Design an enzyme around this catalytic site. Structure first.
Site, PDB file in Angstrom:
ATOM      1  N   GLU D  84       0.829  -1.199   0.000  1.00 17.64           N
ATOM      2  CA  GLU D  84       0.000   0.000   0.000  1.00 17.64           C
ATOM      3  C   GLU D  84       0.867   1.254   0.000  1.00 17.64           C
ATOM      4  OE1 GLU D  84      -3.184   0.166  -0.426  1.00 17.64           O
ATOM      5  OE2 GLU D  84      -3.371  -2.016  -0.536  1.00 17.64           O
ATOM      6  N   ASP D  85       1.866   1.248  -0.876  1.00 16.82           N
ATOM      7  CA  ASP D  85       2.705   2.385  -1.233  1.00 16.82           C
ATOM      8  C   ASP D  85       3.751   2.743  -0.186  1.00 16.82           C
ATOM      9  OD1 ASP D  85       1.764   5.390  -3.132  1.00 16.82           O
ATOM     10  OD2 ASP D  85       3.432   3.964  -3.285  1.00 16.82           O
TER      11      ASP D  85
END
Ligand SMILES: [Zn+2]
Lengths: 139, 45, 82, 98, 207, 48, 279, 523, 294, 41
Positions: D84-85
């Site tokens: 998630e980045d």
């Protein structure tokens, strides 16, 4: 110095970042300031191939890969991994980060906690789960 | 309600039979009788 | 009001997903307020998981009153539910 | 916007986010800070010039106001914390002054 | 040109059909009327020659219920005051309990209150052509509606501990409501063919 | 509402699908009442 | 979840209209009629032009108006090319042109003359060939000049040959199931044609109309299918149970109720009523 | 900073990028009891809108799944034991004494456990006390042709709880129903599906730490034959724009430039004629784009499916789609901004670089260069147009449908009433349930496949006691008599206690399956 | 082509011609041409926050000593007798002939007697020069010579009539083809000139009130009187400009042809170098468009 | 020997009542014309 995740590049198209990592690992080696102006590199000879010539002159892998050993097990990773020198500017949006309320002041009129918000959508969720007692508790 | 008052009449400007009709309606709606509330009007004089 | 007789009961013999939670909750509260535990403890401390141990063996008081929409209600012993 | 190396390779929404996000870096807001009466300034102790740069990063005199450092980035899904980045930061590479 | 002749034919398989659908009984030949069958039955010199003879009737198949029904076509447009009240004593003298009418077009509202009171124990009801000319019940979006006797209505109000005012409603202006001949207070049972799981039975009332 | 913290989240794969990690700060700053019985008396004495 | 598309209104405006305001007069009321066996594509297009409405502007060519008397001459397309995209006859044009066109033209001239204040003397249609239409008008000289080009364009654009009230743009779209998709909603008309089956007709909701002349249960199944299709254009699935419950609550009282002041003003609990909009 | 696992990231719709979360504490014990049993996270495996599950692993775990269950993998004893114990980690969870394994798939000349055996091993350690193993057959996400012509993997089949053939990917465990994890949720109850999801999470993370996975550069580059194919297709379609435009307006390709220019000038003063022109030319360009994509991306690019570290992240479904490797490798194609295409300024030229009434598709916003090689200025401008269009493209209907539907609760006589007392539906929406407990009714093959665990999940010996079995089952057949005068069984007999009463279509479907394809049911 | 025109003047129509004319001191104001359905053209403009509407034939005749054949052969002198333009100009000429007068002096006198109130013109001097004051100060401020204002007005009305008949495409106001930038110092100069003009009008009103009371001090020759009056009024306009810069609410009696009156100044956050530059380069269209979601 | 529909009918009937009583200007019992009253905000 920083592990980034490969799953972030598809659906994001920052192939510019792959090229920039190539160019960084190429420029830091010889000591160039790799020129990266928009719209120089054409379709005939790609920028990737130019920085690849650079790297293979330096000695590393031409696609930018590099053979890495893992630290927690010691024996090499089966697949080579992509290491470059990117330019990481630290952001500052974290200046307003946190507030825990066990008990505190109350309101003048309605004896409420003074101004966390639970209601009018939280109530939807709780009476959705069928949690009468949790609603009547938290509210 | 003042606008509908009759100061000389001391009643409503309406005909007393219409006010009595609505009174019978609101009586019969009390105990839950809908079609019975509407059947009061099937009378013609 | 009426208390529907034991011979004819029209509600579902299943311990609904809600009656289980509230039965366990109220039994946990009761046991937390120094009530009698009806089953041998093996060293568990939480005043709730004791109620889970009680319900696993169906050794629990507290019949439940199911309020039908008429206004009537059934009286189900927690031994009686499925 | 011109100072984004290989800015013609990215999906242009990425260049839009990069402009609107490089306008918000914790970078060197000048060189005279001892004589500034602003409320909140942010300064970066260890900045450098990029190793990949557009010539106009020299022409427009950005050399006097660096924004970030050069991180040895490895594209790899190894730690497991970086979904998630998110990302990691080599500890000693942090305690030596990143 | 002369398309008016098929309109009034189609107003029969919407009326000769509007019998059961109620509980009445009609010969299976007055449901299977062909196009030219109506012409051969009701003919003349024209080629217009349809009116003055559009009147039939039907008796219940329940053998009770006080009493029977009689359908008639008032072809004169805007039936009005001198064509409605004269066609009431006929239903009275045949001992016909309830009757049906048509009108095209614009039934005069002045001829609607002074006749709707003369009905009393009878009910003039209700239709007009050019608005219900093909059976709406023969359709995908309209389920099969069924009436219920006060015994089967008592059974309903008992199995569910209801009051006759807690059920869904159907306004009397609803097309199928006046189709079935509903009175304000009768419980219809509708057979939903909703295809998520089976076809089930909901209930409705009128008020 | 009382007894309700609020913080930034960050991901962790080691704990569980249920569990949520809380720092010892939220451990110390969120408390809930508990009656004391015969068999959890040791836990509560040690806690106090 | 999603609102951005990739003609009828789709997305949260559609749902907003069907389930919040419960409005009659939806923006794109369409119907869809299935054709039968006994019909050919020639009869399909014939019926299509039949139930379709056209405007006298749609057959007229450039319209010249000479000044002086006061004379207007409409050019009408050749009956062949005029009958390819049409099938209204020459006599129909003659009659409706004369009567309604003179009515409209004189009405708008009187409108502008009364605005400026602060009769049809001769008519000659091409009684044989039908490619022009003359109207010779006479006026008092004290009247100021008239923009006859704009006025005649307004007249020819406002006058209609055959319109079924509230319908327009009947169109044909392709499962080897020939159908007719029409804009506007007049069931009362479509009862009349027996080229197409009067049972299997889809409706974009207009649930006021179908609730009015097909029952209450028809409204229920229609609104279920409508919200199903609104959520069907996206790759989001809402099982028929939620839709069934929302629908069968909406058509409870017997009609179809919006979820607004109308529906808020009927509950039995005087605290929710006090709560949600206006205490 | 509080820590939560990735599975919930899909549920909370969070990105771990700075959005923060309220964290409450139910004080009284009734509240924490109901939070633990009713509304606890492992019981939230199914969204309410449709049955399709929302929890499940994400990008890294699923790519490493495609790479672990693949059949060219092999482990020595050390790696097998170690990876297994990293997956299980019993002590932090508990309830189990000693970890048990399988025999090795191959035994000589060196003993080697295979990957599918590790997945089977995890499933074997999490089997409850007495529930027969899982058995299942279901298509996987990585299509069968990517592995080989007439490849076997394709679709996971596994009997009695051992992964027999097929690889696990986004369809197997994740936001996809009828896979492994959803069927574990159905058979072994929710709190075991939660443990299994956690165990797969840690297993794939530990495998990553053993092996590692990265999206390097050459994953993108087209091999020389591939890019020369692309070059040939573009040289072929050098002039599709002019062909489509001239065909639209009516002229031929060999027309004089001046007449085509006059007609074009007459065309896009209007707006509808623009709709037609852009539709035609867009059809032409998209034909070209689909052609060169279909010819290039499967076979043109440098490394094939297993090793290409972006083909994995794309076709396995972790992060991205096929259009993304299309753009990074082959071409961008038409730039569709709010429908049609680039807006023409007053003088009819798309951009000040192009001559007026320019027809060649490069002026119509079709840009041939790819992100890997670099897009040119005239193309980059249209791309900025489309992107910023998107950005200018990217709460009252929750107080309308909620004020009226406050109570709307399913009373005990099983008639969903409003709380004031009035009925809304009998047998709430044709009862069985909102999606949560109704997903597997359509899966008759699965229920009949094993059937030994479902009888123990329903606890037959306790249910058959106090509920009626013969009456509604008998009357059901009579209700299946087509003629009327026998209502649906649900209406006559409530479905909670009369254990024969079930919706009509359910009976129809179960009987059509029992008669049609009973290949499992013996005679 | 803006539809809000239509419901504006119901005899009006959407077609209009806008021109933002500017003086040598960069102090522009607008004055648009409305094409009304009847056929004539209205010369809309703004003064003292208020719209004002005088027919275009009126000021066309009032500007130069003109005879009607000149107006006609100037607007449509070409292709003798082009249908549309010829009948529209005829209708316009007659619709003005309706009520007005003949010569330039009569038109200027009527115009003065109509507009003497709102102009801040000298109360006592004369009446026709007030008409000249309008035709100098409002009509078309960028041009100096009357005959040239006349020529440009003929050209402009010809452009309007060409636009009506569809022979001219609609220029797009929301495009940089028809846009310019207003710098900082020019806005500063406009606001400084506005404050100076307010200061003059204020000491003028103070002198008028001093004279009006009965006659406390009236010595228009004595310098002492001027020292008295200057000492009376507020002589500090530095704080007005400093307030415009401190807040942004441009508080002026006339908007200087500016749509929005708030949000003119940004605080140069030197947080990062790019932030400082990006402050210096940017432009903006004004939130009057942000409130319209399109 | 309350429900929504009951209330849905009561409110409509009372709205009709208040449309009715505000209509009559002349008395039907007194036959006279009571003096009107005009209000303000
Ligand atoms: Zn009186």
């Amino acid at each position: 110095d920083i592990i980034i995740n490969p799953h972030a590049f598809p659906s994001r198209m920052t192939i510019g970042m792959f090229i920039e990592s190539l160019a960084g690992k190429a420029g830091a080696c010889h000591g160039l300031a790799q020129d990266s102006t928009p719209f120089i590199y054409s379709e005939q000879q790609t920028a990737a191939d130019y920085f690849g010539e650079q790297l293979v002159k330096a000695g590393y892998n031409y696609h930018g890969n590099e053979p890495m050993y893992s630290g927690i097990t010691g024996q090499e990773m089966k697949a080579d991994i992509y290491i470059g020198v990117v330019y990481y500017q630290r952001l500052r949006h974290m200046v307003s980060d946190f507030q825990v309320r066990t008990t505190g002041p109350i309101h003048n009129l309605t004896r409420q906690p003074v101004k966390i918000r639970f209601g009018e959508m939280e109530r939807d969720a709780v009476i959705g789960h069928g949690t009468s007692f949790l609603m009547q508790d938290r509210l | 309600l003042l606008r509908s008052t009759c100061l000389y009449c001391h009643h409503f400007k309406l005909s007393k039979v219409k006010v009595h009709l609505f009174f019978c309606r609101l009586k019969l709606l009390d105990y839950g009788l809908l079609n019975e509330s509407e059947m009061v009007e099937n009378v013609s004089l | 009001g009426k208390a529907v007789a034991k011979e004819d009961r029209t509600t579902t013999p299943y311990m609904t997903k809600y009656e289980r939670a509230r039965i366990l909750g109220t039994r946990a509260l009761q046991i937390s307020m120094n009530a009698p535990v009806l089953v041998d403890l093996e060293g568990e401390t939480d005043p709730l998981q004791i109620a889970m141990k009680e319900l696993a063996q169906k050794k629990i008081p507290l019949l439940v009153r199911r309020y039908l929409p008429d206004g009537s209600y059934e009286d189900w012993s927690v031994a009686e539910l499925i | 916007a011109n100072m984004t190396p290989f800015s013609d390779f990215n999906q242009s929404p990425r260049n839009m986010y990069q402009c609107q996000m490089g306008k918000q870096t914790m970078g060197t807001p000048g060189t005279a800070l001892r004589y500034r009466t602003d409320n909140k300034l942010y300064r970066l102790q260890t900045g450098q010039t990029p190793v990949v740069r557009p010539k106009l990063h020299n022409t427009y005199g950005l050399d006097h106001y660096p924004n970030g450092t050069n991180a040895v980035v490895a594209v790899i899904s190894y730690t497991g914390y970086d979904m998630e980045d998110a990302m990691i930061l080599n500890k000693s590479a942090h305690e030596r002054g990143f | 040109e002369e398309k008016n002749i098929v309109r009034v034919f189609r107003a029969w398989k919407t009326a000769h059909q509007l019998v059961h659908d109620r509980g009445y009984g009609v010969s299976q030949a007055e449901l299977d009327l062909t196009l030219d069958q109506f012409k051969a039955m009701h003919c003349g010199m024209g080629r217009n020659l349809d009116r003055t003879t559009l009147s039939f009737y039907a008796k219940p198949s329940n053998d009770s219920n006080k009493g029977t029904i009689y359908i008639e076509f008032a072809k004169e447009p805007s039936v009005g005051i001198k064509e409605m009240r004269t066609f009431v004593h006929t239903l009275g003298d045949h001992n016909h309990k309830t009757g049906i009418l048509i009108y095209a077009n614009s039934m005069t509202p002045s001829a609607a209150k002074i006749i709707a009171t003369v009905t009393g124990q009878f009910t003039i009801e209700t239709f007009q052509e050019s608005d219900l000319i093909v059976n709406i019940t023969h359709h995908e979006l309209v389920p099969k509606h069924i009436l219920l006797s006060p015994d089967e209505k008592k059974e309903l109000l008992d199995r569910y501990k209801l009051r006759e005012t807690q059920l869904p409603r159907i306004q009397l202006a609803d097309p199928v409501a006046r189709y079935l001949g509903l009175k304000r207070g009768e419980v219809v049972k509708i057979v939903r063919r909703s295809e998520t799981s089976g076809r089930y039975n909901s209930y409705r009332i009128c008020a | 509402v009382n007894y309700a913290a609020r913080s930034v989240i960050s991901p962790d794969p080691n704990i569980e699908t249920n569990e949520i990690g809380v720092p010892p700060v939220f451990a110390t700053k969120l408390t809930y009442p508990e009656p004391v019985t015969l068999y959890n008396f040791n836990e509560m004495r040690n806690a106090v | 979840q999603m609102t951005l598309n990739t003609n009828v209104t789709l997305g949260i405006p559609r749902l907003r209209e069907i389930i919040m305001t419960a409005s009659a007069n939806i923006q794109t009321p369409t119907m869809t009629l299935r054709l039968n066996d006994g019909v050919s594509d020639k009869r399909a297009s014939a019926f299509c032009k039949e139930v379709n409405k056209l405007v006298l502007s749609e057959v007229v060519r450039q319209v010249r108006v000479t000044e002086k008397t006061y004379a207007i001459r409409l050019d009408l397309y050749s009956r062949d090319e005029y009958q390819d995209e049409y099938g209204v006859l020459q006599e129909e044009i003659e009659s409706t042109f004369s009567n309604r066109f003179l009515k409209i033209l004189n009405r708008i001239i009187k409108s502008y003359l009364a605005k400026s204040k602060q009769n049809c003397k001769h008519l000659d249609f091409d009684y044989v060939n039908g490619e022009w239409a003359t109207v010779e008008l006479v006026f008092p000289i004290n009247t100021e000049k008239l923009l006859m080009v704009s006025l005649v364009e307004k007249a020819c654009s406002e006058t209609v040959i055959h319109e079924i009230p509230g319908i327009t743009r009947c169109f044909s779209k392709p499962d080897t199931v020939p159908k007719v998709i029409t804009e506007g909603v007049n069931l009362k008309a479509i009862w009349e044609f027996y080229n197409e089956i009067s049972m299997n007709d889809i409706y974009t909701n207009d649930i006021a109309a179908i609730l009015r002349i097909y029952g209450v249960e028809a409204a229920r199944n229609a609104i279920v299918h409508e919200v199903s299709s609104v959520f069907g254009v996206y790759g989001i699935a809402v099982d028929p149970r939620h839709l069934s419950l929302i629908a069968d609550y909406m058509t409870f009282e017997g009609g179809y109720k919006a979820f607004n002041r109308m529906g808020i003003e009927y509950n039995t609990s005087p605290f929710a009523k006090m709560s949600f909009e206006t205490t | 900073t509080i820590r939560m696992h990735y599975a919930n990231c899909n549920s909370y719709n969070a990105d771990f990028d700075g959005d923060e979360m309220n964290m409450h504490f139910p004080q009284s014990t009734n509240a924490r009891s109901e939070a633990q049993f009713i509304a606890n996270t492992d019981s939230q495996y199914l969204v309410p809108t449709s049955g399709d599950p929302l929890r499940g692993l994400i990008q890294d775990h699923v790519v490493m799944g495609v790479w672990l269950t693949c059949k060219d993998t092999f482990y020595t004893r050390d790696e097998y034991q170690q990876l297994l114990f990293q997956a299980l980690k019993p002590d932090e969870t508990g309830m189990y004494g000693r970890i048990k394994t399988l025999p090795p798939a191959i035994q000589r000349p060196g003993i080697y456990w295979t990957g599918k055996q590790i997945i089977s091993s995890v499933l074997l350690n999490l089997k409850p006390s007495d529930r027969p193993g899982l058995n299942l057959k279901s298509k996987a996400k990585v299509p069968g042709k990517y592995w080989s012509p007439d490849s076997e993997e394709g679709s996971v089949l596994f009997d009695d709880g051992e992964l027999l053939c097929g690889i696990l990917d986004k369809s197997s465990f994740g936001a996809s129903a009828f896979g492994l994890v959803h069927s574990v949720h159905e058979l072994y109850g929710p709190d075991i599906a939660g443990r299994l999801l956690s165990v797969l999470s840690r297993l794939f993370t530990a495998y990553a730490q053993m092996r590692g996975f990265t999206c390097r550069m050459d994953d993108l580059r087209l091999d020389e034959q591939g890019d020369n194919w692309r070059r040939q297709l573009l040289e072929n379609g050098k002039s599709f724009g002019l062909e489509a435009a001239s065909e639209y307006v009516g002229l031929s390709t060999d027309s004089p430039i001046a007449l085509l220019n006059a007609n074009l000038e007459e065309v896009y003063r209007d707006d509808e004629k623009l709709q037609g022109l852009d539709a035609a030319m867009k059809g032409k360009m998209n034909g070209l784009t689909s052609s060169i994509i279909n010819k290039c991306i499967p076979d043109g690019l440098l490394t094939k499916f297993p090793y290409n570290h972006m083909q994995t992240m794309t076709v396995s479904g972790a992060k991205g789609s096929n259009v993304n490797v299309s753009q990074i490798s082959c071409l961008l194609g038409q730039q569709e901004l709010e429908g049609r295409r680039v807006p023409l300024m007053v003088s009819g030229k798309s951009l000040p670089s192009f001559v007026p009434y320019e027809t060649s598709a490069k002026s119509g916003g079709f840009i041939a260069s790819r992100f890997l090689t670099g897009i040119a200025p005239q193309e980059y401008y249209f791309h900025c147009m489309a992107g910023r269009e998107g950005l200018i493209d990217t709460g009252y209907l929750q107080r309308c449908l909620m004020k009226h539907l406050e109570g709307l609760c399913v009373q005990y006589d099983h008639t969903v009433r409003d709380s004031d007392g009035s009925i809304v539906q009998f047998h709430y929406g044709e009862d069985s349930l909102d999606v949560t407990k109704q997903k597997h009714l359509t899966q008759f093959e699965f229920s009949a496949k094993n059937y030994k665990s479902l009888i123990q999940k329903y606890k037959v010996k306790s249910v058959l006691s106090a509920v009626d079995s013969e009456t509604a089952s008998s009357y059901a057949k009579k209700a299946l008599k087509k003629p009327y005068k026998y209502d649906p069984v649900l209406d006559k007999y409530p479905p909670s206690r009369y254990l024969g009463s079930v919706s009509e279509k359910f009976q129809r479907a179960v009987d059509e399956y029992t008669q049609k394809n009973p290949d499992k049911l013996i005679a | 082509i803006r539809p809000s025109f239509a419901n504006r003047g119901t005899s009006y129509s959407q077609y209009g011609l806008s021109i933002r004319c500017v003086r040598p001191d960069q102090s522009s104001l607008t004055n648009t041409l409305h094409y009304l359905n009847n056929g004539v053209t209205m010369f809309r403009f703004h003064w003292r926050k208020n719209e004002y509407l005088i027919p275009s034939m009126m000021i066309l005749k009032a500007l130069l000593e003109t005879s009607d054949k000149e107006i006609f052969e100037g607007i449509v002198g070409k292709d003798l007798g082009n249908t549309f333009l010829t009948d529209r100009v005829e209708l316009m000429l007659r619709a003005y002939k309706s009520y007005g007068l003949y010569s330039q002096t009569e038109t200027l006198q009527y115009l003065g007697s109509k507009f003497r109130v709102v102009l801040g013109v000298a109360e006592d001097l004369t009446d026709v020069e007030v008409g000249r004051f309008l035709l100098q100060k409002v009509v078309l401020v960028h041009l100096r010579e009357a005959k040239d204002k006349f020529r440009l007005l003929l050209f402009m009305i010809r452009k309007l009539y060409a636009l009506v008949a569809g022979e001219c495409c609609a220029d797009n106001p929301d495009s940089p083809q028809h846009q310019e930038i207003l710098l900082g110092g020019f806005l500063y100069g406009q606001i400084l000139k506005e404050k100076i003009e307010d200061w003059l009008n204020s000491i003028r009103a103070q002198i008028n009130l001093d004279v009006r009371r009965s006659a406390p001090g009236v010595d228009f020759s004595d310098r002492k009187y001027l020292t008295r009056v200057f000492s009376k009024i507020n002589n500090d306009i530095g704080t007005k400009l400093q307030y415009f810069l401190s807040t942004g609410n441009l508080v002026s009696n006339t908007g200087l042809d500016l749509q929005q009156a708030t949000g003119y100044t940004v605080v140069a956050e030197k947080l990062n170098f790019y932030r400082f530059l990006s402050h210096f380069r940017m432009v903006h269209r004004g939130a009057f468009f942000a409130e319209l979601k399109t | 020997q309350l429900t929504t529909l009951l209330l849905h009918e009561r409110k409509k009937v009372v709205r009709a009542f208040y449309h009715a009583i505000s209509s009559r200007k002349q008395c039907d019992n007194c036959q006279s014309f009571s003096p009107n009253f005009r209000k303000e905000g």
